[PDB]
Every structure is written in C-alpha cells, then in structure tokens.
Design an enzyme around this catalytic site. Structure first.
Site, PDB file in Angstrom:
ATOM      1  N   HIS A 166      -3.230  -9.207  11.163  1.00  0.00           N
ATOM      2  CA  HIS A 166      -4.023  -9.533   9.761  1.00  0.00           C
ATOM      3  C   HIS A 166      -4.028 -10.764  10.787  1.00  0.00           C
ATOM      4  O   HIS A 166      -3.564 -12.097   9.694  1.00  0.00           O
ATOM      5  CB  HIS A 166      -2.588  -8.848   8.941  1.00  0.00           C
ATOM      6  N   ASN A 210      -5.016  -7.451   2.479  1.00  0.00           N
ATOM      7  CA  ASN A 210      -5.506  -7.705   3.746  1.00  0.00           C
ATOM      8  C   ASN A 210      -6.968  -9.078   4.151  1.00  0.00           C
ATOM      9  O   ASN A 210      -7.304  -9.001   2.685  1.00  0.00           O
ATOM     10  CB  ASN A 210      -6.468  -5.827   3.569  1.00  0.00           C
ATOM     11  N   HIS A 213       0.234   5.099  -0.082  1.00  0.00           N
ATOM     12  CA  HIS A 213      -0.755   5.320   0.551  1.00  0.00           C
ATOM     13  C   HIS A 213      -0.879   6.627   1.539  1.00  0.00           C
ATOM     14  O   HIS A 213      -0.176   6.520   2.480  1.00  0.00           O
ATOM     15  CB  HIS A 213      -2.166   4.580   0.567  1.00  0.00           C
ATOM     16  N   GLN A 250       0.609  -1.411  -0.004  1.00  0.00           N
ATOM     17  CA  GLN A 250      -0.128   0.036   0.531  1.00  0.00           C
ATOM     18  C   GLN A 250       1.238   1.706  -0.190  1.00  0.00           C
ATOM     19  O   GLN A 250       1.376   2.040   1.025  1.00  0.00           O
ATOM     20  CB  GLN A 250      -0.817  -0.315   0.998  1.00  0.00           C
TER      21      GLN A 250
HETATM   22  C1  LIG Z   1      -6.348   0.672  12.439  1.00  0.00           C
HETATM   23  C2  LIG Z   1      -6.926  -0.956  11.949  1.00  0.00           C
HETATM   24  C3  LIG Z   1      -6.909  -1.173   9.731  1.00  0.00           C
HETATM   25  C4  LIG Z   1      -7.109  -2.165   9.472  1.00  0.00           C
HETATM   26  N1  LIG Z   1      -7.249  -1.687   8.291  1.00  0.00           N
HETATM   27  C5  LIG Z   1      -7.792  -2.967   7.164  1.00  0.00           C
HETATM   28  C6  LIG Z   1      -7.797  -3.303   5.934  1.00  0.00           C
HETATM   29  O1  LIG Z   1      -7.398  -2.206   5.083  1.00  0.00           O
HETATM   30  N2  LIG Z   1      -8.333  -4.110   5.084  1.00  0.00           N
HETATM   31  C7  LIG Z   1      -8.572  -5.324   5.906  1.00  0.00           C
HETATM   32  O2  LIG Z   1      -8.958  -6.441   5.533  1.00  0.00           O
HETATM   33  N3  LIG Z   1      -9.165  -4.989   7.463  1.00  0.00           N
HETATM   34  C8  LIG Z   1      -8.140  -3.942   8.339  1.00  0.00           C
HETATM   35  N4  LIG Z   1      -8.260  -3.908  10.280  1.00  0.00           N
HETATM   36  C9  LIG Z   1      -8.793  -5.157  10.167  1.00  0.00           C
HETATM   37  C10 LIG Z   1     -10.594  -5.098  10.139  1.00  0.00           C
HETATM   38  O3  LIG Z   1     -10.826  -4.237  11.295  1.00  0.00           O
HETATM   39  C11 LIG Z   1     -10.451  -6.921  10.884  1.00  0.00           C
HETATM   40  O4  LIG Z   1      -9.569  -8.105   9.949  1.00  0.00           O
HETATM   41  C12 LIG Z   1     -12.091  -7.151  11.260  1.00  0.00           C
HETATM   42  O5  LIG Z   1     -12.934  -6.010  11.502  1.00  0.00           O
HETATM   43  C13 LIG Z   1     -12.895  -8.736  11.600  1.00  0.00           C
HETATM   44  O6  LIG Z   1     -13.916  -8.728  11.760  1.00  0.00           O
HETATM   45  P1  LIG Z   1     -14.443  -9.474  12.443  1.00  0.00           P
HETATM   46  O7  LIG Z   1     -15.750  -9.336  12.625  1.00  0.00           O
HETATM   47  O8  LIG Z   1     -13.924 -10.793  12.252  1.00  0.00           O
HETATM   48  O9  LIG Z   1     -13.707  -8.799  13.879  1.00  0.00           O
HETATM   49  P2  LIG Z   1     -13.890  -7.674  14.756  1.00  0.00           P
HETATM   50  O10 LIG Z   1     -14.001  -6.730  13.944  1.00  0.00           O
HETATM   51  O11 LIG Z   1     -12.238  -7.665  15.939  1.00  0.00           O
HETATM   52  O12 LIG Z   1     -15.463  -7.848  15.835  1.00  0.00           O
HETATM   53  C14 LIG Z   1     -15.242  -8.945  16.750  1.00  0.00           C
HETATM   54  C15 LIG Z   1     -16.545  -8.369  18.117  1.00  0.00           C
HETATM   55  O13 LIG Z   1     -16.800  -9.340  18.614  1.00  0.00           O
HETATM   56  C16 LIG Z   1     -16.620  -9.018  19.958  1.00  0.00           C
HETATM   57  N5  LIG Z   1     -16.204  -9.827  21.102  1.00  0.00           N
HETATM   58  C17 LIG Z   1     -14.890 -10.149  21.117  1.00  0.00           C
HETATM   59  N6  LIG Z   1     -15.359 -10.821  22.036  1.00  0.00           N
HETATM   60  C18 LIG Z   1     -16.182 -10.839  22.509  1.00  0.00           C
HETATM   61  C19 LIG Z   1     -17.211 -12.494  23.311  1.00  0.00           C
HETATM   62  N7  LIG Z   1     -16.307 -13.042  24.439  1.00  0.00           N
HETATM   63  N8  LIG Z   1     -18.446 -12.116  23.681  1.00  0.00           N
HETATM   64  C20 LIG Z   1     -18.927 -10.910  23.234  1.00  0.00           C
HETATM   65  N9  LIG Z   1     -19.098 -10.308  22.170  1.00  0.00           N
HETATM   66  C21 LIG Z   1     -17.096 -10.448  21.284  1.00  0.00           C
HETATM   67  C22 LIG Z   1     -16.265  -7.667  20.101  1.00  0.00           C
HETATM   68  O14 LIG Z   1     -16.327  -6.412  20.940  1.00  0.00           O
HETATM   69  C23 LIG Z   1     -15.843  -6.969  18.533  1.00  0.00           C
HETATM   70  O15 LIG Z   1     -16.765  -6.165  18.707  1.00  0.00           O
HETATM   71  C24 LIG Z   1      -7.710  -3.204  10.174  1.00  0.00           C
HETATM   72  C25 LIG Z   1      -8.028  -2.728  11.532  1.00  0.00           C
HETATM   73  C26 LIG Z   1      -7.402  -1.780  12.630  1.00  0.00           C
HETATM   74  C27 LIG Z   1      -7.228  -1.532  13.826  1.00  0.00           C
END
Ligand SMILES: Cc1cc2nc3c(=O)[nH]c(=O)nc-3n(C[C@H](O)[C@H](O)[C@H](O)COP(=O)(O)OP(=O)(O)OC[C@H]3O[C@@H](n4cnc5c(N)ncnc54)[C@H](O)[C@@H]3O)c2cc1C
Ligand SMILES: Cc1cc2nc3c(=O)[nH]c(=O)nc-3n(C[C@H](O)[C@H](O)[C@H](O)COP(=O)(O)OP(=O)(O)OC[C@H]3O[C@@H](n4cnc5c(N)ncnc54)[C@H](O)[C@@H]3O)c2cc1C
EC number: 1.1.3.10
Lengths: 576, 576, 104, 52
Positions: free
Chosen positions: B506, B551, B408, B406
């Site tokens: 990641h 990503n 950017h 990236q």
């Molecule tokens: C700054 C930043 C930049 C990013 N940029 C990119 C990018 O450009 N593209 C890329 O693909 N991704 C990127 N990512 C990663 C991307 O955000 C994640 O891969 C993605 O959000 C994962 O989705 P998810 O639904 O699996 O998990 P999460 O988004 O982590 O959601 C999991 C959730 O479950 C919850 N939880 C956890 N434990 C419990 C429990 N025991 N009981 C009930 N709830 C619970 C949480 O509170 C949370 O809301 C980035 C991350 C960050 C922080």
C-alpha cells in the site's frame, strides 16, 4: 453452437490438438471442448513461460505451476491439532473436510498426481522434453517385423517432432551446458553418450526461448478465418464433458453429454467420430461414467460388461532428484585458456586469451564471453556470465542404464527457493525409472464420492512393483549419486531423494493399447480405437502400455497421428 | 506503431486505465505502453481469479500471486552454508548473488515490497477492497472550505466507484459473513459500526463473483473498433519505458524513450501529453532515470535540480494478521432455528424450520440453506453449507480506532490455509495502520547497481516513525487480539503477528501531491501535474501525501479523474 | 541404520586455532577463534569419494530415510579435532610442540 | 538431548539473521552487534561451527 459435427474432441491439450491439426487440415468439421478456460494471452493455449518477465525470473514460474495443478486424490487428513483454543469448534473425528477422498488408502496412493484444467492442458506449463523411446520402452505397432515397426515409429516421431518443433540445438552456446556436457562425455567416454535434451522450443534471442505448447501444434483459433478459409473448427472452453452415450449393442457412440459451466445448460452433441484426450486420469473417468469398466471399488466377483482392463496396469515412473553445486575444479576450468594479470578492480587488471590457439580447451566464442564478463564485472568472483543459459543435458535410457536422465535447470512444482548459493553454480538432476505394468495397480472411481465437477472421484491403488522395477529404482538413485559427484557435491536442502509418487506426472496405461483386447489386457487397438466401437478413439499417455522411463508426450502424440490415419481411412468429411 | 500520439500512458494497471477511459472517451489519440504482457485470457487485463477453476479452488490463487510479485529490493544474503562438499566451489565473502542489492540495508528495508509486470498490473490479482478515505486520511483538494473539499471528494469517489463497479451487497446472503457481522455489531453496539467491505466486484451467480480489474475500467481493446468506431487507442505490451526526455529549459517533456522487449529496438515516442502510471516504485524510477530528484545514495551536500521531494516522505502501512477458528457457540447458533427429528444418516432423519416465526434468530434465506445442507449432507458435522460465500466484514478507520480492519477471507501472497481444520471455520483478520510521512523515509535508486531491466536499482531506507505511528501500530495489534477473540481462538500456524514491512503493498508518497512545491514538500499539484512541466502527469498511490490506513487504490483513481479534467481543458485532440 | 563415514584431513600450516587478545569467553579466558577450510587436493577429493562410497554402500542395505538424506555435517560436529599442540621428533623439522614423550 | 545440553559451542560468529517483524514499539537493533556470547573475531565462512 451447432449440435452436429464430423469430429468432437474432448480436451485441448497437445494430444487433442494433434487430432485437431490432422483432422481440421483434412477438411473435417471439428469441435473441441475443454472444461478449462483460455487464460495464456492472445495465443490460445500457448506456454505460460513465454513472457520476458518469467524468463528473467524462472524460479517464480514454480509458483505458477503449483497454482494450476489440482491434486487428484487426497486422503482424509489425520494431522493432530491439539492447541486450539478451548472455545473454538473442535472436531471429534478425522472427518471428510476440504475435498478429501475417504476411499483413498494413504499408503497406496499417487499422492503427487495432479491435473491442470486450462485450455492447452499441461502444455501451458510443461518442461518440453520430447525424447523418442527406443524399442525396449515402446509398444509394438507391427509384430513379427522389427524393421517395419522401426520404420513406422520413425515416420510418426519425425512428424510429431515437426508439430512440436523439437530440436537439440537451442542451448548449444551455453557455457554451463557445455561445461557439464563435456565433463560427463569425457568421464563416461565410450560407456555412455551425452547430448542435449531434445526440447520442443525455438530460441528467439540469446535471452529468450519460445517454448512450445498445444498452440504450437494447433493455434486453436476458430475456423474458417482469413488464414484458413476452407477449414472448420470451434473451440468451446468452460465446458465439462460428462458421458459418451453407447448404443444398446455397444458398437457405436451415439452422443456426448456436456455441461456448459458458464450458463448451466446441459446438451447432447452428436458427431461421426468421438475423440477423448482429457488426460490419463480424466479419459478413464469419462469412460467409467459412461458404463465402461467398473464403477466403484474393484470387485472381481463381478466382471465388467466392457473393457475389463480399463484403469488397471497403470504405470507411473519413479523419480529421484537432487541439486549440485559445481566443483571448484570445473569452475576454474571455465577460465583455463585465460591470462589474468593484476588485481580485479584496479586499472592494471586484464584478462586476455589467444584466439584460435590449437591447445585452447574452449572455443573462441566461450573465451570471448568469459573475458567480457570478467573484464566488465570485476567485483564478481565467478567466470560464468550472468545471463548464460541453463544446462540441458541428457544420457538416454539404455539396457545397461534403464532410466531417463536430465541434468539441467527448469521449473517444476517442487522447485525450491535458494538464495544463499549463486545460481550459476547449481545443476538439477532428475532420473526417471520405468515401471512394469501390473494388473493390481489401478485407477478406479468412487460410486459415492464426487469431485469438484460432480464426477466420480478418482482413487489409486498403487505400489511400485517388487522385482525389477524396485531394483532398478534403487540402482538409479545410486547412479545419480555416482554421476552427480563428477560435477559437484549436493546442494544443502536439495539432497538426493525419491519424489512423492506421481509428482513426476508421467502416468500411463490407464486405457492401454494392444493388438488383442483379451490377450494383451488392453482397451484400445493400434489405431487407438476402443475395442468394439466403430467411432470412439482415445488419445494420450493412458494408451502407452509398456514400462517407460523417458518423458511420454512425444510418443503419445505419435500414436495420435497413427490414429488420425485410421480416421481419414474410414470416415468422410461433411461437404462444406 | 506510430511515433506520434495526443496522449501516452505508461502502465496499464487500473490507474493508467482510468486515464485511458477518460481520454480515449474524449477523443484523444492515446497509446499505452506496458513492460509486461497480456496473460489473463481474451478479456485484456482482467482479474485472474475469474475462472471457474480458481473459484472452486481459491486457496490455489495464493500461488498465482506469489509467482507474479517480484521483490523490489533484496539485500545481500548472509546465510552461512557450511555443509557444502569440500569439492564444491565455496564463497570467501557474502558477494552479490542472484540479483541482490548491495545498497540495501537489511534492517531499514521494505523487504515485503514487490511489483507485478503484466498488462493490468496488480489489479489482475488484487483483493478488490475499495473504501473511501475520511477527512483525516485524505489530502485536501480545496483549501479553507471543508464542505467544498468534501463535495469534491464525493463527486470523484462516486465516479471512481462507478468505474470499478464498487458495491457493498455482493455478500449479503453469506451465512459466515452475517454470522461474523452480526456478532461484532452486537459486541460493539453503539461504539463501532460494521458493514461489508466495499468491493469492486459484481456477483453473477450464487457461486461466482466477477472481480473487477483494470479491464472493468477500460477493456484495453485497440480502437477504432466496431463497438467504438470514433475512438483511438493502441496498447503496446512488452515495452519498457525508460526515460521521459526533458527540454533544456525543464518546462516540457519532448519524448518518451522506449525499449521494445520483443524486437530489442529502442525508439522515442512523441505525444502532446505524458502520463506516468507505472506504480509507486516504478514511476519514481522512471523520473529519476530522466533527471528528476537525485540519483544515488541521498546527498544533502548536493540538492538536486528538480523535484527535491521525489522519493522522500514515503509511507507504507503496518499490517497485523491472524486467522481464527470459529467458536463452538457461534457454530451452534447457525442452526438455532432448526427442528431436528431423529438421527443423522438414519432413515427417519428430518430437519425443518418455520419460515417467518418471529422467534427465529435468523432470516429464511439462512435457514433454508442450513436445512438443505443438513439434509443433503447428513455425514457432515457442520451446519454451514459447503458453497457458502466468504465473510467480508469491516469496521472503517475512526479517530478512536485509527486503523482499517478486514475480517474476511481472500487470497494474498502469504496466509495460505491448510487442510487440518475445516475451512468453513476459518476467518482472516487484517488490520492496517497509518504511517506518518517523514522526510528521512526514502525510496532511492542506485547510480551503479541496476535491476533486471537494466534500470537503476531501487533501494529503501525506511523505519516506522516513532511516536504516533509506532504507538498506534501496537494498539492495533492489541485491538486485533481483543476483537478476534469474540469470534474464535487463533488458528495454530496463523498466530497474531506483524507482517514483513511492505507485504501489504500500500506504498504511498513516493511522488507526493500538494498545493505548493516547497511549502508542501511535494512533486505534483492537485491536477497531478509535475511542477514546472506543462505536459507531464503522474498517477497512482505515489501521489497520496497523507498517513492512511484504508486501501489506497480508489483514492488514487479519484485523483486520476481530477487530473483528466485538467488535461481535457488544456489540450486539444488531434483531428480524426 | 545410521551411516557415518569419517575422512582424514591433511595438516596445513594455515589451518589455525587462535585466541583473541581482546574478547573473552565465559570463564574470562581468551576467546577461541578458528581459521579453517578443508585443504584442496587430497583431502577434498577423498571427502567427496567418501560421500559416493556411503551412497553406494548404504544402498546394499536399504534406501535413504526421508529426513536423513546423505549430507556433509557441519565442520567440527564430529568432535575429532587434532593437531593443535602436535607431536613430533624435532620441534623445527617436524613443526611441532611436544616430543614423542608428550613433553613440551 | 543430554548431549546437546552439555556441548557448548567453541566460537559462534556474530548473528546476522534479519528479524523484520518486531512490533514498531519494540527495541530494534541498527546493526548486527555482539549478542548472546558470539565472537566478532570469527569469520563465519572459515569456522568449525560444530566444534563444542
Ligand atoms: C494480492 C494483492 C492484493 C491487493 N488488494 C488490494 C485491495 O484490496 N485494494 C486496494 O486498494 N488495493 C489492493 N492491492 C493494490 C492494488 O492492486 C494497487 O494499489 C493498484 O493496482 C495500483 O494501481 P496502478 O495502476 O497504480 O499500478 P500497478 O497496478 O502496479 O500497474 C503499474 C503497471 O505499470 C507497469 N510498468 C512498470 N514499470 C514500467 C515501465 N518502466 N514501463 C512500462 N510499464 C511499466 C507494470 O507492468 C504494471 O502493469 C493489492 C495488491 C495485491 C498484489
Ligand atoms: C510441470 C510439468 C512438466 C512436464 N514436463 C514434461 C516433459 O518435459 N516432457 C513430457 O513429455 N511431459 C512433461 N509433462 C507432462 C505433459 O505436460 C503431459 O503429458 C501432456 O500435456 C499430456 O497431454 P494431453 O493432451 O494428453 O493431456 P493434458 O495436457 O492434461 O490436457 C488434457 C485436457 O483436457 C481437459 N479435460 C479434462 N477433463 C475434461 C472433461 N471432462 N471435459 C472437457 N475437458 C476436460 C483439461 O482441462 C486439459 O486441457 C509435464 C507436465 C508438467 C505439469
């Protein structure tokens, strides 16, 4: 959007919500504009620290504060970077870059001053301390009758304390709070009095405090709704209020010009009553953009039509800060009533005490908590339980110690990451000075440079006044070194220091109050009405015209309540 | 809160929201639990960067991200603080303080790894890059027929891209974007292809981009509602899900044990179908707290009963980073098509260009912006307009450059730029390596230490495998140094460096997918169903079993969509 | 102006300088090792009072220089180490190594 | 600077700073071993670290 209201309020901070609460409750048709947005959850303008996650990770909240605070005047940067690659574009001068203010003298700044543009204002992240001012710090509401003045401030503060849900009991069972309160009380016995910081907050559980905010004062929901079917209120976020329009005789405001940041549209809103509660910097910016005071670099050889005192006599407090690490003696005292036998980590170890014993140094509730901690966590070397709440201790301002003190733990923009020392040991010390109001200390606005909302760029010309203010500030630093040593030695990396001017965010006197515009060098009267204008009121810390050390919001709120009394005496609500 | 639903989903990030969109839309009675709370505004789980204020101050968003990311495993601190006052309480050992993890080896950690507990998960603050994986980075969904595998991935990716609103033209009229794109396109002509990072975002105006988030996938409003009278969905924030309860036969989940953080009460919720989407770390924690895998320090002398591959074969990407300051030659080419009369500031200053003159190096949309910038801001020494959108350039993973790149500008927990160098000159370089999955790379949970929510403390044992992963990572660093130099030299303070393991966030393979539990060393099959269990599904990056550089979120989303197709065929909605 | 205030440390048997029987220094001599803490009681209480006295005293001349705020320095940076071969009248009664003529 | 140059520290404990951003191809330590003159006998928390 209606274009006609009884009352329009600019800013959705706790002082604009005071006006909402009073005026909406009394039947007025009220609109409120905020340049910022609803972010804080389903409770509009509520405190962002009211999540379980932040309360388990309170140091993380500093980063949230840093994130929303936008510096008010940043001087042009003169840092020298002379290790750029020879191929990279390299400047020839220190030019105006990244939003900096070339009007700003870098040595006469409140470089720490900053604002928050969100619904609920700074109350979405403040530390909720709401002490009353004693007479020495407080403006007169009644002259030549001290008991009447005292009585009027008492009624207003009591009301204000109800809106904020101020109390002094939320930390009464913390071991750390009592350890430090009792030690200071004993050491200064009969010289100074210590109590809990009065805090706008309600404790929900042993591990969670519901911190108060604008939302506590007024829930910010559109009305009528099923809970208030006869009230009328609309909040409009992401709307920049730019100018109030004066009539030609300067006796009335005729309209408020707004800019809806989402659509781009620009409108005139008409009201009977105009209330400005956009903060001490931004109230002043809007007034000056509207032909009040003087635009541009002050120029005495050219008197303003209106409000010549606007943006002069500004005050901001001196702040000294340190952290300590609790003394060996105090930590040993935590387990003074305990009988400890055997070695921690073996089956023969035990920790007991005598409940109710007259010569116990501590009450049974303290001793049960210590006991349980020591017995369930025998690997841990300290007697303080892991989820013990933080200390919240103060000795309030007095003639003999003319500064406010907080001896506590909370989140501010300048909090540091500390990992090596156990957090149970660490206490913050914040002492706040009062600053004499001086005409030469000014907030003024450029006639050339504009800020990120295309309004006149704010500029400070500020130094702490020589004389009493400066002598007290150095005496106050000494007091903090002397007092803190009763509790422990300084924590390396948080040694005693004056903070950057303005970081304390308690700016006052930018649109100050007094009885007479000329004699008291002021902008508004004791009803918070702008001199000369029938229907224009200002609320906030900018009104406070005195030298104060204590945290000002509660006082500003009390002035707003008196202001609403005047409104209800002079304007009639539209029939529903 | 009912106790009975068709489907229950743990976690409200974008993968949980994918299951919600699919199953609430197909008529199932769905409940969703998240341990964090609604903060983001009236659009539940929406991107926090979507305020006018963040977008006029994007560098401040770094602080928001820092405040919400909580470190997964922090080893015991061993910093020597030997300047405490002799009176202060002083440690004899480096004991466990401040939530550190004594199980953690500090030299085999993913110290950068952190999690976000808020409704919407990390999508409330991510950077929205959603590339597809090519064959080499992607797990097989169809055996022994590459073209059918391809077709199935294209069908899933295209739905996922629809759910996220993935696009590749939101930055097409950025000067900086095109300046970098064009120069890199020319330098690698016929060797590597460059394009816009595919971004989940919709442009709303020249200065505003609506970044996508969980909310974009599913709005998280309770149903039934006016806009969806036949659907059924309840979101319950601030509820820690602690265990799925296995039947004695290990064939089915019988209930989900929850802790309501606000009331404090503990309940069991029944559903037909249980879906875990709590992130790659916390899905694993919840399974291990429920009797899957092995609790405690791994012990081969004791095979676990179920899912022996759980928490093994973990992957995290290597990440190299720097910032550059734009070359003089590139900066000068921005204005190559302009005719300039006289002298800036002075009366007679004119800047013009000929629309369409094929001798122009740049399109008309570009020159019009340069020209307008240089006429309205004659004091500014650069020809890039102040509001020009950021660059968003990539060349995707290929066999001969096996890393995602990236080039950017965006907000991350690190990488905060600063005020000495004009921000229009600055470009961020992030190159991301793929890591081979290895059994010895593990995420495990302590049997004694617990985290802030009283769940088994996560612990890493990780090193970048030697051989290809390590060789590739060093080649990737060199590639960044060579490539970056065509655009400009390094920015002092952002020199080329490997980022702390795990800061890239990641993490993959903690509960990995495959065809056959034993031959593929995996935990879920290609329907994301946990082997042996009828009614338990997992979503997220933890499913991905391959070595990937790009990503992972779009790929995780795609697998969730396949999973939903299985659920729809195999469970019936309760009648409404 | 610099402010340097130096406290006195009570002589305690447990505060020692000893030499490794295994590890050697740069000149192939036994490696020096310290086992030291400022004694609780008088030494520690004085040292903290001494901190307070420097803050109170220095304020009469001016305020602290940013970057040189009041702090305890790293133990031994002061380089006034004593008592490692101590003087007394009687080897046993005074727990010492040399007499008042500096003779072993 | 002259002074800092001639003062040699008397007992430096074993260093336990975590450097976790080395290139994956660089030689990387598995333990905090005795490096660069340090003294493994020295308790870091009962030292005169400024003695030179
Ligand atoms: C700054 C930043 C930049 C990013 N940029 C990119 C990018 O450009 N593209 C890329 O693909 N991704 C990127 N990512 C990663 C991307 O955000 C994640 O891969 C993605 O959000 C994962 O989705 P998810 O639904 O699996 O998990 P999460 O988004 O982590 O959601 C999991 C959730 O479950 C919850 N939880 C956890 N434990 C419990 C429990 N025991 N009981 C009930 N709830 C619970 C949480 O509170 C949370 O809301 C980035 C991350 C960050 C922080
Ligand atoms: C970290 C922190 C700790 C603090 N701790 C305390 C403490 O413990 N005790 C204490 O008393 N105070 C403390 N303060 C200060 C306190 O928060 C403020 O005094 C208080 O919020 C002032 O209230 P207000 O309503 O006047 O202004 P604000 O709260 O600043 O609200 C003004 C508002 O108007 C808006 N606005 C500005 N310009 C425009 C415009 N042109 N058009 C429309 N809207 C506009 C803003 O977006 C904002 O919402 C703290 C604040 C900070 C940040």
């Amino acid at each position: 959007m209606d274009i006609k209201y009884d009352v329009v309020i600019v800013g959705s901070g706790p002082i604009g919500c005071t006006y909402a609460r009073e005026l909406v409750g009394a039947g007025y048709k009220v609109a409120m504009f905020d340049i910022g947005e609803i972010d804080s959850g389903l409770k509009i303008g509520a405190h962002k620290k009211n999540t379980v996650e932040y309360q388990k990770n309170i140091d993380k909240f500093v980063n949230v504060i840093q994130g929303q605070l936008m510096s008010v005047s940043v001087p042009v940067n003169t840092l020298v970077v002379d290790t750029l690659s020879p191929t990279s574009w390299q400047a020839s001068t220190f030019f105006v870059r990244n939003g900096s203010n070339p009007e700003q003298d870098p040595l006469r700044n409140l470089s720490g001053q900053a604002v928050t543009r969100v619904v609920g204002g700074m109350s979405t992240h403040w530390a909720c301390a709401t002490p009353r001012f004693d007479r020495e710090q407080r403006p007169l509401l009644v002259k030549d009758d001290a008991d009447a003045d005292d009585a009027e401030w008492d009624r207003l503060y009591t009301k204000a304390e109800s809106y904020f849900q101020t109390g002094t009991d939320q930390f009464k069972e913390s071991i750390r709070h009592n350890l430090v309160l009792n030690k200071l009380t004993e050491e200064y016995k009969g010289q100074r009095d210590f109590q809990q910081i009065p805090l706008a907050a309600t404790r929900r559980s042993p591990t969670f405090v519901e911190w108060s905010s604008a939302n506590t004062v007024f829930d910010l929901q559109n009305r009528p709704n099923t809970d208030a079917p006869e009230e009328r209120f609309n909040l409009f976020p992401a709307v920049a209020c730019e100018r109030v329009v004066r009539n030609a005789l300067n006796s009335e405001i005729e309209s408020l010009h707004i800019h809806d940041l989402i659509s781009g549209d620009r409108f005139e809103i008409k009201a009977d009553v105009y209330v400005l509660t956009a903060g001490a910097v931004h109230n002043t910016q809007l007034l000056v953009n509207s032909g009040f005071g003087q635009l541009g670099r002050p120029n005495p050889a050219n008197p303003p039509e209106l409000l010549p005192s606007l943006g002069s006599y500004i005050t901001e407090q001196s702040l000294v800060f340190c952290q300590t690490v609790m003394s060996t003696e105090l930590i040993d005292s935590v387990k003074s009533d305990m009988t400890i036998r055997g070695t921690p980590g073996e089956l023969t170890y035990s920790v007991t005490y005598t409940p109710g014993a007259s010569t116990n140094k501590h009450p049974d509730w303290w001793n049960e908590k210590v006991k349980n901690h020591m017995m369930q966590h025998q690997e841990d070397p300290l007697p303080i339980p892991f989820e013990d709440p933080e200390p919240q201790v103060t000795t309030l301002f007095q003639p003999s110690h003319p500064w406010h003190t907080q001896i506590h733990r909370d989140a501010f923009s300048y909090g540091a990451v500390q990992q090596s020392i156990d957090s149970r040991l660490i206490v913050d010390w914040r002492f706040f000075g009062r600053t004499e109001p001086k005409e030469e200390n000014k907030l003024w606005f450029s006639d050339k440079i504009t800020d990120a909302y295309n309004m006149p760029q704010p500029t400070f010309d500020f130094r702490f006044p020589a004389g009493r203010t400066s002598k007290e500030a150095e005496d106050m630093m000494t007091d903090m070194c002397v007092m803190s040593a009763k509790i422990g030695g300084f924590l390396p990396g948080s040694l005693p220091q004056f903070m950057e001017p303005g970081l304390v965010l308690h700016l006052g006197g930018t649109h100050r109050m007094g009885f007479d515009e000329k004699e008291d060098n002021c902008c508004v009267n004791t009803d918070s009405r702008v001199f000369g204008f029938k229907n224009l009121f200002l609320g906030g810390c900018g009104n406070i015209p005195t030298a104060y050390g204590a945290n000002p919001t509660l006082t500003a709120m009390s002035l707003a309540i008196k202001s609403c009394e005047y409104i209800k005496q002079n304007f009639t609500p539209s029939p529903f």
